[PDB]
Structure formats: C-alpha cells, structure tokens
C-alpha cells in the first residue's frame, strides 16, 4: 500500500500523480474538481490514477466538475471511512454537470459515518440515489430532502425507461425498415389492455428517433467515454412507429437502437435494446488485378485475386475465354519492301412546440361557452477442325486464384473474363426468375496473344521446274495453310554452288500462285542451290532445305 495524500484533485495530472495508490489518507477530504474542457479520456486518466484505491480515510467531495459523466473509475474502491466534509457528510456531491451514474451496478460500497449530500445534479438520477441507502452503515429508511435535492436533481435526466420491442420486417441489399411492435398510448388510455407506457398529451411526444451504425462485432456500447460522439447516425423523429432506412452496405453487420423524444418538461421516456442485423449478400466486387501470361502457342496461364469486399460469400469463380477475330493484314502499306521483326504490343429544442401548446390551450379555453452474356455458365466452343477452342468457360472453386488453359488456336489474340458470384440466397430465390438476378459482379477484359508455333508452317511441296528445257527456271511450292497469322510474303533464295558466292534472297506477295503456284527467274548458266522462306503478319518465318539444279 501507499497511503497517498488526500485533498484537492483540481486536474487530471494530480490523479496521474497518485497512480497505484491503494490507500488514501489525510483527514482533509478528498476533493475532486476537474474542470477539464470535455477533451476526452478524462475518465481514462482518472482510472489510470485512482482505480487502485480501495479505501478512503477522510470524506470525499466533488463539485464544479466539467465533462464528467460518472465516478465509475473507482474500480477498486470498497469503503469510505469518512474522517472529517464535516461529520454531517461522508460524501458530498454539488453542482456536478453531466454526472449521471454512481459506482458500478454490481459493486457495493460501505459508508462508515454520517450522511451524504446530493443537490444540483441535473443529469443525476434521483432513483439511483436510493441505491446508496443499503450502503450506509446506519441503514436509514430513506434520504431526506435535507440530504437529497430531489427537485434539484434529474429534472432532465429521468430514467423510468420502459423497454421497447423493435424488430425489422425484412431488408434488401441496400435498405431496411424498423417497426416498433410495442404500442404506446399518446392520449390518456382510459385503461385498455396493458398499455405499459403512456404520455399525458400527444403534442408533448415528439416521436421516435432512430440510431444506427456499423459494427462487425456487434458490441458497441450505448454511451461513449467521450461525451461527444457521432458513431451513431441519427435521423429525424417520427410518430408512426415505423421507419425506413436506405443507402446501406450489402451484407454489413449493423447495430441500432431507438429512443422516445419528448418535451423537456415531460419526464417519461422509453428506450429499446441494442440489436443487430446483416444486410443480405449483395453484388460482388469485381475480381482484382487479373493478369495472364501465354505459356505456349496453345497454352496460357491466368492469375487473379479477390481483395475487395465480397458483399456475401463467393460461390464460385467463373471464367470465359474467347477468340477475337484474328489479327488481319494491314494492306495500308507494303510488306516485302520492308520486313517485320514480329514485334508485339503490351440537443433538441422544445420552444416552438410549447409555444403552440399554450396558445392552443388558451384558444380552446376561450372558445367554448359554459453487352455481356449474363447466363455465365461453364461451356466450351470447339473448332470445326477440333484442334482448338474458339471459346472456353469454366466454373472454379473460390479457394484458388490461378488457372491454366490449353487447346487454344495456335496463333491469335484472345479475350478472357473472370468473375466471382454469390449464392442464390433464400431471401431471393422466391422470385429470382423475374430478372432481379445481380448475383454476379461485372468484369474487366484481359487481352493477350499466344506464342509463335514450333515453326512458321514451313512452306511445303517445294520443287524447281523448267519449261521447254532458254526459258527461265521455275520454282514451285504449295502455300502454307497454318501460318502464324496471315502470310504476307514469300522469300525465295538461292546460291551458286562454288566457293565464296553469296546466297541471294527475295520477297514477293501472294501473286501468281493461283496461275502456276510457282515463281520463275531467268537465271544464268550454272549450278545453284535453292531454298525459300515466307513471312506472315507475325513477321519473319523460317527457311526450307536445299534443292539444286544446273542451268544453261
């Protein structure tokens, strides 16, 4: 124990000074007069300092405090010896604004001697005072007016709140309604069934006001340690007992509560419990950072991830892959004359109501005399030749974010899509046939191209010819059928079979193949070797083997 000094605590740091003091001594009373300007954590610091104390030797006093809601920081406090403030008062409470709660409900304190003092406590609750009655040693039947400023306390802090049932009827993906099933009598009931809560005048009862907010854990308290708080979105009053909320986050854990709003002169009120709900699985967020890489002319690797909000539970990933129209010849300018390297691209106020109130009373007393296929299902489109799929689709489990796809057309650009989707919720399956839908999110395109083939469809049926065997030599071959994109030129080549001769080469469009399927040249007398390659929209091809002829 530390038996630290009693006396004045005018500010939080003095409480900080007495940190860890299990016992407080000094016959002079412990006086608490923190006038802090509501800047939060006043209670936190008080408990940091004073929560250790379990017993107080002298009496204790509290008055002129600013922003203090309660003494709840006295966690360890057990008993007050009350050594004299005078013998009359072991505990003294005067002019304490914002104060509305005493020691913890499950805690019980003991008061050694004398009485207490409670006056000018507007937010303190008179009924709560009686809780101290068993705490005093002398066991008085009740605290007298001399001790209790009943008329001077709680006049705008009343507490007789009848609990209010409140339940939804349903909720959409973005909205909800609340419908207080508890019935409230606005006029004097003249004694119908039950009617547990009542008001003496409908005009005095402003209406129900709704509080709601967002809490994944469903544990947010009603009050706040800082008296200023805005975590609760608060709306306008209404009297029908029903309200509609909108602009809500789909499948989000909410918390809500309602309270009655009435004139300050009126002191009866009712209040509901803290309740929660979730807001239906809504539209999924579209997949995140989708990307793919080609593994072969026939294969591609696709990857993705889901970091954004699910707005529900991912039933399955869905994939769509399509062949776009294959890249086509750009006849705008000539090939051959220039080749191609097969490059690629990428508080409330009552005044008005009361003014109406009294004027109406006087009047009445005076008058009277005496672009997307949203089917989104697995499917494949197989080529007529069946060597490739022009379209591919697949369902995948939601527990892996990459996949590989094969049997694509050997050379082409592809367009693919990936999307996540949610379940057919029971709240929606009852009528999810009249469109509605919205189970699956939108998506974004990914564009990619396959690799070039093993070889550029090596032109086949190569041979060399000569007519009237003089006439020029002729070379013939069958055009390629499976080039990497449209063929753009044929590159014929030959060399003279002697030392240090270069091997010439050419390039030509698809001309004259229909006529004779072969090219000709008036080559001079000699023996030469011949070969050829061709180039497609995917730039260069590759060469063939050699053929030989003697000329004259």
């Amino acid at each position: 124990d530390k038996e630290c000094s009693s006396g004045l605590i005018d500010s939080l740091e003095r409480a900080r000074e007495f940190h860890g003091c299990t016992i407080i001594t000094g016959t002079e009373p412990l006086t608490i007069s923190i006038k802090r300007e509501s800047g939060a954590h006043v209670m936190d610091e008080l408990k940091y300092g004073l929560a250790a104390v379990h017993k107080i030797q002298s009496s204790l006093m509290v008055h002129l405090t600013y922003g203090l809601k309660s003494l709840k920081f006295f966690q360890s406090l057990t008993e007050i010896s009350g050594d004299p403030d005078a013998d009359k008062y072991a505990l003294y409470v005067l002019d304490n604004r914002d104060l509305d709660e005493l020691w913890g409900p499950n805690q019980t304190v003991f008061i050694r001697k004398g009485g207490v003092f409670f006056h000018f406590n507007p937010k303190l609750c008179v009924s709560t005072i009686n809780q101290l009655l068993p705490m005093l040693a002398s066991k008085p039947k009740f605290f007298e007016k001399s001790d209790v400023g009943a008329d001077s306390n709680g006049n705008r802090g009343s507490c007789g709140t009848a609990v209010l049932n409140v339940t939804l009827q349903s909720v959409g993906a973005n909205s909800a309604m609340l419908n207080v099933t508890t019935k409230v009598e606005i006029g004097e009931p003249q004694k119908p069934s039950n009617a547990t809560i009542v008001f003496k005048d409908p005009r005095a009862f402003i209406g129900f006001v709704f509080y709601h907010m967002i809490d994944p854990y469903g544990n947010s308290t009603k009050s706040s340690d800082d008296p200023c708080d805005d975590r609760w979105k608060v709306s306008s009053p209404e009297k029908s007992g029903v309200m509609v909320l909108s602009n809500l986050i789909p499948y989000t854990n909410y918390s809500y509560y309602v309270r009655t709003m009435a004139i300050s002169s009126e002191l009866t009120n009712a209040e509901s419990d803290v309740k929660n709900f979730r807001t239906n699985p809504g539209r999924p967020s579209k997949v995140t950072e989708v990307v793919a890489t080609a593994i072969s002319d026939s294969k591609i690797n696709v990857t993705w991830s889901y970091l954004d909000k699910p707005y529900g539970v991912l039933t399955r990933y869905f994939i769509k892959a399509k062949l776009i129209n294959r890249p086509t010849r750009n006849n705008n300018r000539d090939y051959c004359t220039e080749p191609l390297v097969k490059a690629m691209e990428n508080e409330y106020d009552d005044r008005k109501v009361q003014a109406g109130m009294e004027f109406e009373n006087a009047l009445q007393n005076f008058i009277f005399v005496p672009d997307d296929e949203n089917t989104y299902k697995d499917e494949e489109d197989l080529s007529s030749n069946k060597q490739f799929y022009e379209v591919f689709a697949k369902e995948l489990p939601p527990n892996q974010t990459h996949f590989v796809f094969e049997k694509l057309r050997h050379f082409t650009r592809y367009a693919i899509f990936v999307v996540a989707c949610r379940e057919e919720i029971p709240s929606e399956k009852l009528r999810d046939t009249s469109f509605k839908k919205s189970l699956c999110s939108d998506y974004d395109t990914v564009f990619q191209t396959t690799k070039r083939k093993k070889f550029a469809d090596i032109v086949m049926d190569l041979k060399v010819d000569l007519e009237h065997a003089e006439s020029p030599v002729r070379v013939r071959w069958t055009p390629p059928v499976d080039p990497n994109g449209e063929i753009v030129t044929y590159e014929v080549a030959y060399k003279l079979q002697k030392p240090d001769q270069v091997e010439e080469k050419k390039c030509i469009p698809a001309a004259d193949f229909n006529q004779t399927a072969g090219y000709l040249i008036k080559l001079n007398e000699g023996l030469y070797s011949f070969r050829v390659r061709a180039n497609s929209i995917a730039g260069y091809g590759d060469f063939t083997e050699v053929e030989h002829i003697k000329v004259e």
């Binding site: 005048d201 009373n361 009445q364 007393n365 009277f368 005399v369 005496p370």
Partner: peptide
C-alpha cells in the same frame, strides 16, 4: 368552467362535457 381547467387538469367525462353541447 373552462375546459382546460375542467379537463386536462383533474379528470372529467363526456356527461360533464355535455354542458357545452347546447344549441
């Protein structure tokens, strides 16, 4: 007497209010 004094201050009943309903 004035209705607001005879009603809404101390109880009353229709048969008492009938005093006003004289054409």
């Amino acid at each position: 007497g004035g209705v607001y004094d005879e009603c809404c201050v101390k109880t009353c009943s229709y048969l008492e209010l009938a005093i006003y309903c004289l054409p």
